[PDB]
Nucleic acid binder design. Structure first.
Lengths: 471, 140, 600, 493
RNA sequence: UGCGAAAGCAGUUGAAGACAAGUGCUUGUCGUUCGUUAUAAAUGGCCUCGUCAAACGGUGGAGAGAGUCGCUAGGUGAUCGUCAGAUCUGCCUAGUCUCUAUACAGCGUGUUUAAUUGACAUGGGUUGAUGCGUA
């Protein structure tokens, strides 16, 4: 923000604001306050406005107001980027605006991939809500409905400078996954750093994994360890699963690739840092982004679903149990065990409940009519959530059309008991529900594309007293 | 800050006179770097083969660890020290096969060898470009 | 988890009371104090014969025996080692009843006879506890009286529970404080449960509750870690202390088939949520938390085996998974002979790993919703197909495709309904029986593409298809869960170059490197030699398969002359690979005086 | 608004054999002084009290070295034959010494002229003379007579107690802390004998078998005793009377051993052990007695000592060599009118109601390359990368930052052969290292694609490419080999 | 743009209307429409609140620098030359050997697992700017 002094043509600066300045105004009889609107053009999926009221005396934020800041997979409704000197990924040129609007409407109507699902996390110790914004995490308190922090978790050109023109084509590191241990004292983050274009190393993405810690009283997460290129070079980490309380008192986690490899990391007190405890070989030449991972509460067995095949691998030997292999009709999207007995496996064409004790599928429900190609691999997992006590929930969203598809959506929540025998509840919401997850209480929280977090859960003295106050 | 950077390939926590086998065994057992360094100073390949040939299989494993750390810290020794590593694997290969764990004990070799090989595709790309420009002005 | 063979401890005497095998267990009593995980000694009271102590290991042997008159039945017996006024002593406390007229309570002290005392009991002594710390012997009587005595059998305190006909009394300790509970039958299948605390009075009542619907006549009762186990009519009822509240009822179908009267059942706990159940001569180790049969054993040489007592592990704290249990075995023959036997038991790790796939309990796609939004009868089929005449391909294809409304000869996502496995297996059985030789129906081609092709039919599936060329390439490409061994045998036996590349691609894609390496170790040295010669005569998948071979062959096996030819080929390939890579990168990649002619 | 983030230095993944916090402390004993004595320095001891001077026994004299000055301050040359001990008492006032003649001399420390007490312990040599730690009056002596007499300062005519039972030379004596009655002695029998002075004595309560001649026995803690003999040192627990740990990392026979605890190092306690192979190594009792540091000297080490826990100043590590050399390593530790006019600065608002603090803490000064990047001076920041005496890691960051900012061509437009050679010179050496190889490949690619024409007309630029092509070709061989050793290393597993 | 793995496999980038410039014709443009899954460049770069010195605690290191004609393995030059070799008691690269404030980089010592203090009147004026030092 630049204050031009017109008498001498000089200027004063207030740099490193949270976003580009959509609007600016002087608010006060004597110009006491400045009101700003910030945009945060990093998130292309949605336009993230923040209202900043600054004290003109010392240019400090008197009041910063913004709602939840989720990053949806694809742009929603009629979100359009602001106008810039050039057409870039974070902006539109003068000419490109109208064509981009038409293309966006045509994409929303005609195309069949209509994924806007967003990743969100819940802090167990505090029940704060963590949104992995691009290259940063927004910590938001939904009980109070106010933001509590915004922390940069990656390297990159994030607040060092304001990108302009060709610099606006740069892509900052993207926080693909963000998860907490069951204890809640450790934070695990997975990052993808994109190289700059037009170099020899312009096609080799860098995959980073980071372990952070903080005491409960503190508010900032401190990076404790950093793994560069886990699982090898240019190999993503598709899935992250924090360990149960039984194993290592919740100081472990598994990372799973698209090559079928698994790596188990744990916090070693002697080394004082996280080290790779166990490894599985991703040697075979089969690739798939559809990878799901579940762990028994006891910690004895781990369920690894790669492409169409599910494997029961023992933790001790970190290998197939000595039936371990289960073939499925289509690719596995999410594997979750509502209870130690019942394992609920969702494939791209159906969802099934199986008894590990009997090894026999109990119930199977068709999903193909609703989920055929709407979502990319792995996002049905962030749609399906499970309680550890009562049961799970299936979320199914439909476009509404009367006489070609229309922009508005309708969402349906279905509460299922363990093994899916009965539908405990059936509710309808009037908007696309991006993400639904289980708060550690009985209630479930869900996030709307309108950025709304709903919850599904179970005398003379008297006269003188008045007048004196008036005076 | 003071965080530790690491990688996913670090599997650490998962015949003739003139042979210097006598000095090598003593140096490895006592971790005497100076005594070890004199042994590695010999470059005659005939010596290198014979010393490792008579060296006890139990001590061979720790020799691989010592060479790996020296190669990782100093890249210029990658050449002369490799022949030690190559002969250790050839001679003590049978013993190395029958060990309960190799990744934890040879973690230093795997990390060091893995690092160099990963640069291989890039260096070919640079070499082709350098040849292209080198060819051009040489003919002109 | 596993069950060891029984080994004999002693041969029971031929007494009339012990001749009734159904009631034989009640006449043999086991001391609680001497029988635990760390004790190598067992004290036993055999009605009318003696009260004996045996050493278990290294070899069973009799160490001490106290004769008893044959007319007497041992109602309660206990033995505990301790210090008494200080000398290390072993206190033996046991009670007898004589034709129901007189009841004897006896305590014997032995130096590790120092003293022997005898008093008349008011009612039948059911449970005896020895507190060596305080030098006390506590006896529970059937008439509800709990009497505390010294080692001289002088009565110190007497507590009455206000209920008679007491039927069950068991001991337990918690947090170092000593507790006891007892169950007293009432009328109309009602049972008073009371929990008592042993500490002015040394007995304090903590809880008193009446349990309805709790029968004794056909119920076997046992206790472990604050839980009470009651087997009745093939159902195990779970009651939790201190209120003895019903938590769970476990159905055990293997007992539901037992005719009432002939099947001899005994029940004992062996660890947390793990019990031992016997039905005649068969021994079952059950995990009740997961409802699984951890182990089963049949004793063919004995008619029946009844559990008397078991040494219980606290697996939550103990690293040891091995324990022992004792029972009475009855032999087959015209003159049955009863023997006391000991069984060693591996309880396991108490993890879900142990109970997976061992449950003792024995689909159709359903719409998600019962009822303006954008859209993105098996047995009769089998009956119709079976009724056809043999070798009738056209009719068989017509019925299968038309009736299931399949449009394609390969599986598609729209055929999800047909994914029921039982139907596919029966169709496969018909295809085998209905057709043999060189002609198979198009239904087989569709099934080969089905993701849920039964595993049972995968074996030899390539072998059945060795006639027809086209059926391979459908099976190799798409048939699921094809065994690796058959693919490797076909890999090294086939000369067709195209099949080799597809088989190589299939093997690597669906199997891990280590799994393949083990199998190639089995393949003959000539076959691998032939394969290597094929090479010297998509390619990486064939070479990567070669690099696996050299790993399987090992250093010793490989031969020098062939190694020379293989080395030369690889060096040529490396040069070519280097050459091509250079090409690939290339594809990606004023004078003072000048003389010129002017254009006019 | 937020303060500008600092440029983060590039840190590659950790390599083997990193520096440990224990190593960083012990490297600080840098200043080394090598003194030559007449004969082998048999024993070295430290005064328990300030200033903690240490006495060295050599030939027929005892020398006390000042801690701060590191030079001899007192000399005790009254001894006719060889000396064998110089241990101080706990108070530090007295130092006792044994002699080959067997006489034990007690002198006032820092007063060599005065002799307080002279004891003829035995006709054989008296190798060990040590004051009791808990009790000041009683002095212990062990001689080649194989009887370890316990003398009393007041009564010097007869020993208070005369322990026996050793079948060989006794050259080691130790007092267990918190157990004044207990006394530990180790003989060349290989047996460590423990005695109870409260009882009648003269017969060990029990013996611990070391199996090799015991050269020195030290009680690290009240319950743990560490004994060094033969080629290893073993730590015994008296409550269990069995050896908890044993370390035989030494080559020659370990000779001396010392223990220091509760000192300012990262390691709470340390155990230094001489080897007789020229090595003195540090062990951590908190970590199962694992090696944490080591030194090498010219010849065999006979005595080692370290400054006591409460040194109160510069610490000292002392090594004693049989050749007579003494090696010392040390870790060093206006007008009144104006003031009355300006007298408020010292006040910190202790008595005030509200204390208000807004001063921002001083950030470290930024380097030239960081300032240029902060000011968007892309070309100048590149120049600062290649300057004489610039750290290799710091040069890599500015190259990585410029790439991350997307300014690789932007920094390279306005350049010629004169200002391009510094970048190529670094690239020639940076290509060798694994960390900078990838960055060199990108930067070298751009300059070629951006200065092809200039390269043709400039001969000096060409030569930089010829040698560079030679070096990259050499890296190809190294990377290709690493794949082959990796390839065969897979065959083994 | 679709699919997929990240590698890649297939497929696109059209028509009309209006305006400006140049000479009805040509090019270029669009805060204009329909349809399809579908270079840049107006000299224009980010504030201030406190600096300097000396310590301490972890985290990294290619160590920061100087010697040693002491060894090991290489590369290579000037002149002469009977091609065997000579004088430069040749040079360079790497390792080893000796040494020092770990001498090098970085985060922190508002409370943290650990770890700090000290100096200054944070002003105004004059001279020197051909400043000061060095070849």
């Amino acid at each position: 923000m630049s204050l031009w002094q017109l008498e001498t043509n000089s200027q004063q600066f207030l740099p490193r604001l949270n976003g580009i300045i959509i609007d600016c105004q002087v608010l006060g009889p004597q110009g006491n306050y400045y009101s700003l609107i910030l945009q945060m053009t990093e998130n292309n999926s949605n336009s993230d406005y923040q209202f900043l009221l600054l004290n003109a005396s010392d240019l400090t934020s008197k009041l910063s107001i913004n709602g939840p800041l989720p990053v949806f997979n694809s742009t929603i409704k009629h979100i359009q980027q602001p106008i810039s000197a050039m057409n870039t990924k974070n902006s539109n040129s003068i000419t490109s605006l109208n064509h981009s609007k038409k293309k966006q409407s045509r994409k929303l109507i005609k195309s069949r991939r209509q994924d806007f699902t967003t990743n969100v996390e819940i802090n167990p110790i505090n029940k704060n809500l963590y949104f992995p914004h691009i290259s940063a995490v927004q910590i938001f308190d939904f009980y109070k409905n106010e933001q509590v922090n915004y922390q940069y978790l990656t390297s990159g050109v994030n607040n060092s400078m304001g990108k302009v023109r060709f610099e606006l084509n740069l892509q900052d590191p993207i926080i693909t996954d963000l998860k907490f241990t069951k204890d809640g004292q450790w934070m695990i983050t997975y990052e993808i750093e994109y190289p700059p274009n037009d170099l020899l190393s312009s096609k080799d993405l860098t995959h980073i994994l980071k372990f952070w810690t903080k005491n409960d009283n503190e508010t900032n997460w401190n990076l404790k360890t950093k793994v560069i290129n886990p699982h090898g070079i240019s190999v993503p980490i598709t899935k992250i699963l924090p360990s149960p309380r039984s194993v290592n008192n919740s100081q472990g986690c598994l990372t799973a690739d698209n090559n079928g490899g698994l790596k188990f990391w744990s916090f070693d007190s002697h080394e004082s840092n996280w080290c790779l405890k166990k490894i599985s070989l991703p040697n075979f030449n089969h690739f798939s982004n559809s990878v799901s991972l579940a762990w028994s509460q006891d910690g004895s067995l781990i369920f690894h679903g790669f492409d169409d095949k599910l494997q029961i691998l023992d933790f001790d030997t970190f290998k197939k149990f000595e039936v371990s292999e289960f073939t499925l009709d289509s690719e596995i999207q999410t594997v979750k065990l509502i209870n130690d007995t019942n394992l609920i496996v969702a494939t791209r064409t159906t969802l099934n409940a199986i008894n590990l004790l009997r090894g026999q599928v109990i119930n199977s429900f068709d999903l193909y009519p609703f989920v055929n190609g709407v979502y990319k691999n792995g996002h049905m997992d962030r749609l399906i959530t499970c309680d550890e006590r009562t049961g799970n929930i299936a979320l199914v969203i439909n476009q509404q059309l009367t006489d070609v598809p229309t922009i508005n959506y309708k969402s349906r929540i279905i509460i299922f008991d363990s093994d899916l025998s009965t539908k405990l509840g059936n509710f309808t919401h009037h908007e696309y529900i991006s993400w639904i997850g289980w708060n550690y209480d009985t209630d479930f929280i869900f996030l709307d594309i309108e950025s709304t977090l709903g919850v599904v859960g179970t005398s003379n003295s008297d006269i003188f007293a008045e007048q004196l106050h008036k005076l | 800050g003071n965080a530790r950077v690491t990688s996913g390939d670090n599997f650490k926590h998962v015949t003739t006179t003139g042979t210097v086998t006598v000095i090598l065994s003593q140096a490895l057992q006592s971790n005497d770097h100076s005594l070890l360094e004199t042994v590695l100073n010999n470059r005659d390949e005939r010596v290198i083969r014979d010393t490792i040939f008579r060296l006890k299989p139990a001590l061979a494993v720790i020799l691989l660890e010592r060479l790996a750390e020296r190669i990782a810290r100093q890249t210029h020794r990658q050449g002369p020290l490799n022949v030690w590593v190559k002969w250790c694997l050839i001679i003590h290969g049978g013993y190395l096969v029958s060990i309960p764990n190799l990744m934890s004990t040879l973690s230093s070799l795997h990390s060091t060898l893995k690092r160099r090989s990963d640069l291989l595709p890039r260096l070919l790309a640079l070499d082709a470009r350098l040849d292209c420009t080198i060819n051009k002005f040489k003919t002109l | 988890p596993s069950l060891s063979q029984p080994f004999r401890l002693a041969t029971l005497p031929k007494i009339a009371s012990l001749s009734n095998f159904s009631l034989q267990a009640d006449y043999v009593q086991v001391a609680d104090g001497t029988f635990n995980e760390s004790t190598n000694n067992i004290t036993l009271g055999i009605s009318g014969s003696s009260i004996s102590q045996y050493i278990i290991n290294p070899t069973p042997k009799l160490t001490f025996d106290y004769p008893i008159p044959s007319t007497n039945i041992i109602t309660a017996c206990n033995a505990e080692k301790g210090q008494a006024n200080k000398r290390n002593v072993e206190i033996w406390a046991f009670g007898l009843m004589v034709n129901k007229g007189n009841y004897t309570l006896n305590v014997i002290t032995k130096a590790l006879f120092l003293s022997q005392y005898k008093i008349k009991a008011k009612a039948k002594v059911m449970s005896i506890k020895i507190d060596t710390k305080n030098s006390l012997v506590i006896a529970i009587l059937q008439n509800g009286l709990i009497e505390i005595f010294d080692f001289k059998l002088t009565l110190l305190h007497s507590f009455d529970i206000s209920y008679d006909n007491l039927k069950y009394a068991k001991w337990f300790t918690e947090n170092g404080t000593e507790y006891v509970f007892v169950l007293c039958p009432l009328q109309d299948d009602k049972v008073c449960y009371k929990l008592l605390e042993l500490t002015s009075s040394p007995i304090k009542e903590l809880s008193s509750t009446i349990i309805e619907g709790f029968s004794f006549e056909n119920s076997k009762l046992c206790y472990q870690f604050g839980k009470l186990y009651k087997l009745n009519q093939g159902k195990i009822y779970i009651y939790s202390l201190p209120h003895c509240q019903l938590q769970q009822v476990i159905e055990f179908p293997m007992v539901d088939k037992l005719s009432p009267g002939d099947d001899l059942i005994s029940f004992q706990p062996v660890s947390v949520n793990r019990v031992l159940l016997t039905v005649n001569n068969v021994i079952y180790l059950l995990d009740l938390l997961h409802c699984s049969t951890l182990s089963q054993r049949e004793l063919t040489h004995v008619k029946t085996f009844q559990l008397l007592k078991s040494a219980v592990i606290n697996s939550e704290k103990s690293h040891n998974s091995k324990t022992i249990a004792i029972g009475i075995s009855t032999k087959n023959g015209p003159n049955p002979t009863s023997s006391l036997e000991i069984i060693n038991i591996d309880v396991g790790t108490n993890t879900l790993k142990d109970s997976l796939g061992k449950s003792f309990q024995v689909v159709i796609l359903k719409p998600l919703f019962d009822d303006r939004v954008k859209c993105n009868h098996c047995n009769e089929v089998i009956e119709k197909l079976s009724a056809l005449q043999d070798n009738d391909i056209t009719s068989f294809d017509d019925i299968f495709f038309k009736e299931l409304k399949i449009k394609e000869e390969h599986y598609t996502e729209k055929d999800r309904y047909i994914s029921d496995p039982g139907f596919l297996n029966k169709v496969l059985d018909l295809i085998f029986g209905k057709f043999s030789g060189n002609d198979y129906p198009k239904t087989l081609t569709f099934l080969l593409t089905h993701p849920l092709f039964p595993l049972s039919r995968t074996r030899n599936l390539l072998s059945l298809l060795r006639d027809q060329p086209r059926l391979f390439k459908q099976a190799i490409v798409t048939c699921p869960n094809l065994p690796l061994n058959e693919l490797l045998e076909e890999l090294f036996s086939i000369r067709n170059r195209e099949l080799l590349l597809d088989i190589s691609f299939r093997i690597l894609q669906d199997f891990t490197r280590d799994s393949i390496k083990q199998e190639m170790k089995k393949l003959s040295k000539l076959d691998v030699q032939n394969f290597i010669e094929f090479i010297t005569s998509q390619s990486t998948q064939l070479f990567q398969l070669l690099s696996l071979v050299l790993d399987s062959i090992g250093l010793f096996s490989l031969e020098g002359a062939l190694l020379e030819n293989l080395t030369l080929y690889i060096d040529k390939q490396v040069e070519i690979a280097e050459r091509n890579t250079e090409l690939w990168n290339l594809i990606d990649t004023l004078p003072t005086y000048t003389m010129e002619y002017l254009d006019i | 608004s937020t303060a500008r983030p600092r440029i983060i230095t590039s840190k590659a993944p950790l390599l083997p054999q990193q520096t440990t916090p224990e190593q960083r402390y012990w490297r600080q004993y840098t200043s080394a002084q090598l003194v030559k004595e007449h004969n082998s320095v048999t024993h070295i001891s430290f005064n328990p009290q300030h200033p903690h001077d240490f006495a060295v026994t050599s030939s027929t004299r005892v020398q006390i070295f000042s801690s701060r000055t590191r030079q001899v301050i007192k000399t005790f040359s009254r001894f006719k034959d060889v000396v064998y001990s110089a241990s101080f008492r706990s108070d530090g006032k007295l130092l006792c010494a044994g002699d080959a003649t067997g006489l034990v001399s007690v002198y006032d420390s820092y007063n060599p002229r005065t002799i307080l007490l002279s004891i003829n312990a035995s006709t054989h040599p008296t190798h060990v003379t040590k004051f009791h730690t808990q009790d000041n009056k009683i002095l212990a002596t062990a001689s080649d007579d194989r009887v370890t007499r316990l003398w009393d300062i007041s009564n010097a005519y007869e020993p208070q107690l005369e322990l026996t039972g050793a079948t060989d030379y006794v050259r080691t004596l130790s007092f267990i802390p918190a157990a004044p009655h207990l006394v530990a002695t180790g003989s060349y029998d290989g047996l460590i004998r423990l005695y109870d002075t409260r009882s009648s004595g003269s017969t060990p309560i029990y013996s611990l078998n070391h199996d090799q001649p015991v050269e020195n026995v030290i009680a690290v803690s009240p319950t743990q005793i560490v004994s060094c003999g033969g080629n290893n040192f073993k730590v015994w627990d008296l409550t269990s009377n069995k050896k908890l740990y044993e370390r035989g990392n030494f080559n020659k026979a370990v000779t001396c051993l010392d223990y220091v605890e509760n000192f300012d190092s990262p390691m709470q306690s340390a155990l230094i052990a001489s080897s007789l192979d020229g090595h003195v190594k540090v062990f951590d009792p908190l970590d199962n007695f694992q090696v944490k540091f080591g030194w090498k000297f010219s010849g065999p080490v006979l005595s080692c000592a370290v400054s006591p826990s409460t040194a109160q100043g510069n610490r000292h590590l002392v090594a004693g060599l049989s050749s007579g050399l003494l090696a010392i390593r040390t870790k060093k530790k206006k007008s009144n009118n104006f003031q009355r006019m300006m007298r408020g600065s010292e006040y910190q608002g202790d008595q005030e109601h509200i204390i208000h603090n807004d001063k921002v803490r001083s950030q470290r000064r930024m380097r030239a390359f960081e300032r240029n990047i902060n000011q968007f001076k892309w070309s100048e920041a590149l120049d600062n990368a290649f300057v004489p005496g610039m750290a290799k890691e710091l040069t890599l960051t500015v190259l990585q930052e410029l790439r991350k900012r997307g300014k690789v061509r932007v920094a390279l437009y306005g350049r010629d052969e004169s200002t391009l050679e510094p970048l190529l010179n670094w690239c020639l050496k940076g290509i060798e290292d694994v960390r900078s190889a990838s960055i060199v490949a990108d930067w070298v690619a751009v300059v070629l694609e951006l200065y092809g024409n200039t390269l043709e007309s400039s001969p000096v630029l060409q030569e930089l490419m010829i040698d560079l092509k030679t070096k990259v070709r050499h890296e190809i061989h190294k990377s290709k080999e690493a794949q082959r050793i990796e390839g065969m290393l897979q065959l083994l597993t």
